[PDB]
Write a protein that binds this ligand. Structure first.
Ligand code: CDL
Ligand code: ZMP
Ligand code: SF4
Ligand code: SF4
Ligand code: ZN
Lengths: 52, 208, 52, 113, 96, 43, 114, 95, 49, 176
């Protein structure tokens, strides 16, 4: 959950209250290399759900 | 008008218009207006004596089955003599649709409570009492739900100020949190943001 | 674009706390599935409506 | 075939759904005969109840009856027939086919103000 | 990553899962904190011709709600939409 | 243009299903091990 | 001028409800002074109840006094059941508030309020 | 370019200083009045007037999209320089 | 055996802070004794690894 | 398009019944849970050594506010009041007048950091990059009024943090 707050902070600058998704779309585009780290999170998160 | 304009759903517009005709002719004792918005939402505007027949019909009819009360809402519009607009958002899971049921009251006329139709409404219309002062007759436990226990007035009325009338602080003399009249160190700065030019010619009200 | 991603919807059977626990865990599984589909199907383009 | 569960919690499996639906539909029509003929609720509910009763009588199977009654499981079709019966018994008391009880005030549904 | 093979094998045995293929601590596989500058695309209204705003005006095509009935035959009974199609069970993993 | 995009072949496969890998002995075997430990202790 | 009532058809039933609500508050005041362990006396709290009832003594509309009885029953229900704390009960007694200037001249001295 | 009142209190770039008999100097007693000593009116005065050969020049404050909006400054007055309304950099037509 | 490599890494952490004095200095100031590559040092004395 | 969590009827042959009875009497899933907790005993913990190690941040981070300058020392704020027009908390208070060389500058620029919701609408509304929201988050005070920033505090934060603020804007201005 800390790593997903890092995803929010990389996309908006806030870890929780991003004000990012806005009427009309989103505020700002994805920074480069964000989707690779979302991939690296999602590739391992199944094992986390498994051990929970 | 392709990429940036919301595409119009003509099928759902026609279907909700036909169902609005259906509800208007099954219940003409209470139905006043039926209107479908441009983004395909169906509003039934009723007389407040038919809160229980219209909602029980929409809950139990085989071509309605609006088993889910999504939301129940008052809206305060002070220029109308029946200033409170009680809005029922219903959800049909059988037919995958939503309907809006709207009715009116002023400060003194009670609306009949709809907990016999939807038990979801128990806290919603209690919140409408707490925030607007709309009394719901024959309610199981009608009281405040969101404001403080000694609270005077109904905060979501539009003649009620943003900061209220009282504010709290701890007072060391009486060893007690006390209520004193509200004073702001910085006043809420009101911004007159409205443009003097008409934005939407399709919504122009006709002159007197 | 939820009509373009592909996920299953977990359904309980007994209405209890335990089936709602299992529904939330399986919704985390299916969120991982949707995130994999979103990372693979991200389109190019602008991120706001181009109505200024 | 004895459906083991409906999947819905608290919805018991009905052993004989056909006879139960026939009793419910004819009882809806019996109650609905006490409404005037010019009432649109009577005409519409007789219409859909006769359609559902014809579908129930014309299909001995339960699964195909579910696929063509088009209303989910057969036990919740039974429940909706019960709800329609209870509604018709309430609609006799309300008499909502009568004319409009009161016109609204002149700018009551005028938005924006 | 710096765990010795004995602790790594003990940890994999007690978990029952291979834990080194999916480590929850991040290392050199993550993106570099210094990135090249982007060149972001523009929208479809960034055109020099055939681009009149009245031909793409979203807010002005909104209309007031069409009043169906107001208080100022053997027509078919209708529903608000067609009935919802019955969901199919999962082919991926039904838990059956 | 340079935008945050997936690579050419797409990303790799991401697991999302339960893996509770069914370890341990059988029910016959575990009672046999317990009864064997009892009999060794008794002897 | 044909309005739907709340509880009372006219003012006599309305005064009956006002009277029963006053009886209920008068019975409750010793319990409120005891279990909230207020620093007031029972006579002082009863004078406050009489003050709150005489504050609304000008109302001639049955629906308005029906709502006044309803809100008084809600206050009573929040006071009998311990939902209010001691602070909510003592907010009727404006103790930390300074005494406001009453006549013209002292209001002239302190400020601009009429 | 901070100057000092006779009470010893520093004066901000606005010109704000508390009086000798104003009680609100007690908030700085035992503490400090925080001013910024880089006055912008003194720092922009140190920038030299840019000699350009055109009748109209443009300024965006340097940096492209990192500056201010691009405005066009007329330079027909030979008595007075043309000053940017955003950044305060001033320009002179060399002829 | 790979335990000997762990103990030699611990002893070279003791050595990489300049002996036991620097080792206890970083053990009590930082609560962390591991050694790193000195990236730089600012004008105050903060050292970055 | 749906799956049934917990709709498994267990096998009633003697093998599976003895399996479930061995699970009951010999606590097999409890030893499984002990093994998973023991597996985390021998992992390297995720604990960073704050304050000597810092949590990772991006150049978009929204921390303490600062008023910026041009590369001449001239302050960028030209008193246009867009930032207090958009400020959803009304934390910003601005007064203004022409200063002694005729320039449109502020005399007041207050930001109540205890009203502020740190959403960065002021830095995206500002047409001249004057108000920005810097990387400083380590600015807890001991008194409430030390978080009621006037213009001098914000200009000192700008002068203090410009070497970092300008590099973060340099990294992120093409997304803006
Ligand atoms: C079991 C009894 C203790 C034996 C030592 C031990 O288990 O060492 C852990 C050692 C390394 O384990 P690891 O989890 O893979 O650590 C990887 C580290 O990243 C590799 O370690 P590192 O890279 O962090 O290297 C630095 C580390 C090196 O670590 C050590 O020196 C380990 C502690 C030795 C004592 O040294 C320190 O941090 C200094 C610690 C000083 C205090 C240690 C506790 C003393 C307790 C008694 C007083 O464990 C093994 O080698 C497996 C178990 C061996 C058991 C042998 C039979 C008994
Ligand atoms: C600890 C402190 C507790 C504080 C308790 C506060 C509760 C306040 C409840 C207030 C309820 C009301 O205001 S209902 C009263 C409004 N009634 C009317 O307007 C009708 C006029 N009423 C009267 O004249 C009353 O004096 C009587 C008793 C009904 C008749 O008197 P008249 O004859 O002479
Ligand atoms: S970050 Fe948001 S709340 Fe804070 S000063 Fe800026 S606009 Fe106002
Ligand atoms: S938006 Fe920028 S230039 Fe305008 S008043 Fe605010 S800080 Fe100053
Ligand atoms: Zn300029």
């Amino acid at each position: 959950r800390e790593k997903m707050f890092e995803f929010y902070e990389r996309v908006s600058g806030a870890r929780m209250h991003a004000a990012y998704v806005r009427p009309g779309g989103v505020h700002q585009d994805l920074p480069l290399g964000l989707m690779d780290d979302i991939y690296e999170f999602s590739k391992n998160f199944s094992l986390r759900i498994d051990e929970l | 008008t392709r990429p940036t304009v919301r595409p119009r759903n003509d099928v759902a517009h026609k279907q909700l218009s036909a169902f609005g005709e259906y509800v208007a002719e099954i219940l003409p004792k209470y139905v006043q207006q039926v209107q479908v918005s441009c983004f395909s939402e169906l509003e039934i505007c009723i007389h407040p004596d038919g809160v229980i027949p219209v909602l029980t019909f929409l809950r139990d009819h085989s071509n309605a089955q609006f088993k889910s009360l999504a939301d129940l809402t008052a809206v305060d519009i002070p220029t109308r003599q029946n200033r409170f607009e009680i809005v029922y958002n219903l959800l049909s899971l059988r037919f995958n649709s939503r309907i809006r049921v709207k009715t009116y009251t002023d400060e003194l006329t009670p609306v009949e409570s709809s907990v016999s139709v939807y038990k979801a409404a128990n806290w919603y219309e209690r919140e409408i009492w707490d925030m607007f002062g709309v009394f719901f007759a024959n309610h199981p436990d009608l009281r405040r739900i969101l404001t403080d226990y000694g609270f005077e007035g109904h905060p979501f009325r539009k003649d009620f100020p943003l900061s209220g009338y009282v504010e709290l602080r701890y007072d060391d003399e009486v060893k007690r949190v006390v209520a004193e009249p509200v004073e702001l160190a910085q006043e809420f700065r009101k911004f007159d943001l409205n443009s003097p030019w008409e934005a939407f010619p399709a919504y122009r009200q006709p002159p007197e | 674009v939820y009509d373009q991603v592909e996920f299953d919807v977990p359904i309980g059977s007994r209405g209890d706390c335990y089936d709602r626990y299992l529904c939330r865990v399986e919704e985390m599984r299916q969120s991982i599935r949707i995130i994999s589909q979103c990372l693979n199907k991200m389109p190019p383009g602008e991120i706001k409506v181009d109505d200024a | 075939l004895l459906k083991k569960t409906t999947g819905l919690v608290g919805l018991a499996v009905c052993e004989t759904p056909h006879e139960r639906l026939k009793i419910l539909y004819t009882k809806i029509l019996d109650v609905l005969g006490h409404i005037p003929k010019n009432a649109a609720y009577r005409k519409y509910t007789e219409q859909i109840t006769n359609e559902k009763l014809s579908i129930v009588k014309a299909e001995p199977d339960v699964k195909k009856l579910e696929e063509q009654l088009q209303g989910g499981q057969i036990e919740e079709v039974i429940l909706q027939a019960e709800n329609e019966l209870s509604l018709a018994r309430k609609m006799i008391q309300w008499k909502p086919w009568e004319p409009l009880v009161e016109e609204p005030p002149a700018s009551q549904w005028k938005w924006p103000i | 990553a710096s765990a010795t093979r004995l602790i790594q094998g003990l940890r994999n045995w007690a978990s029952g899962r291979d834990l080194q293929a999916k480590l929850q601590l991040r290392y050199q596989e993550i993106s570099k904190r210094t990135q090249p500058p982007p060149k972001l695309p523009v929208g479809p209204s960034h055109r020099l011709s055939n681009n009149y705003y009245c031909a793409r005006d979203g807010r002005r095509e909104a209309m007031p709600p069409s009043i169906v009935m107001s208080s100022q035959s053997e027509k078919k009974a209708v529903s608000p939409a067609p009935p919802i199609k019955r969901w199919e069970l999962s082919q991926d993993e039904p838990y059956l | 243009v340079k935008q945050d995009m997936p690579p050419v072949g797409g990303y790799g496969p991401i697991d999302y299903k339960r893996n509770l890998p069914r370890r341990g002995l059988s029910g016959y075997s575990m009672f046999a091990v317990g009864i064997g430990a009892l009999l060794f202790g008794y002897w | 001028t044909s309005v739907k009532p709340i509880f009372s058809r006219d003012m006599n039933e309305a005064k009956r409800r006002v009277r029963e609500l006053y009886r209920a508050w008068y019975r409750e005041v010793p319990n409120t002074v005891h279990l909230f362990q207020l620093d007031i006396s029972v006579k002082q709290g009863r004078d406050k109840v009489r003050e709150m009832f005489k504050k609304n003594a000008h109302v001639t509309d049955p629906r308005v006094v029906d709502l006044l009885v309803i809100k008084g029953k809600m206050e009573l229900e929040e006071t009998i059941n311990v939902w209010k704390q001691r602070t909510h009960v003592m907010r009727f007694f404006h103790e930390t508030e300074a005494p406001r200037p009453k006549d013209f001249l002292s209001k002239f001295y302190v400020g601009h309020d009429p | 370019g901070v100057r000092t009142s006779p009470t010893g209190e520093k004066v901000t770039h606005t010109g704000q200083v508390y009086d000798d008999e104003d009680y609100r100097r007690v908030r700085f007693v035992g503490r400090q009045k925080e001013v910024n000593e880089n006055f912008a009116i003194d720092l922009i005065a140190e920038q030299p007037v840019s000699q350009v050969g055109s009748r109209v020049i443009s300024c965006d404050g340097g940096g492209g999209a990192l500056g201010h909006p691009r405005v066009y400054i007329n330079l027909d007055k030979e008595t007075k320089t043309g000053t940017c309304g955003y950044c305060g950099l001033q320009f002179r037509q060399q002829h | 055996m790979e335990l000997l490599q762990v103990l030699k890494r611990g002893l070279q952490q003791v050595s990489g802070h300049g002996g036991l004095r620097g080792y206890l200095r970083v053990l009590f100031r930082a609560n962390d004794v591991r050694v790193g590559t000195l990236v730089g040092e600012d004008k105050y004395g903060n050292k970055y690894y | 398009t749906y799956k049934y969590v917990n709709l498994r009827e267990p096998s009633m042959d003697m093998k599976s019944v003895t399996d479930r009875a061995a699970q009951t009497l010999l606590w097999t899933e409890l030893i499984r849970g002990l093994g998973m907790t023991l597996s985390y005993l021998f992992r390297e913990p995720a604990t960073i050594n704050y304050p000597f190690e810092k949590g990772p941040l991006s150049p978009r981070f929204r921390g303490e506010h600062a008023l910026r300058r041009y590369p001449s020392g001239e302050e960028r704020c030209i008193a246009c009041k867009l930032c207090e027009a958009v400020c959803p908390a009304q934390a910003i208070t601005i007064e203004a007048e022409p200063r002694a060389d005729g320039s449109r500058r502020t005399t007041r620029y207050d930001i109540d950091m205890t009203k502020c919701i740190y959403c960065g609408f002021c830095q995206e509304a500002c047409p001249v990059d004057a108000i920005v929201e810097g990387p400083n988050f380590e600015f807890s005070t001991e008194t409430h009024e030390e978080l009621l920033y006037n213009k001098e505090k914000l200009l000192n934060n700008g002068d203090k943090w410009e070497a970092e603020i300008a590099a973060n804007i340099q990294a992120d201005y093409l997304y803006r």
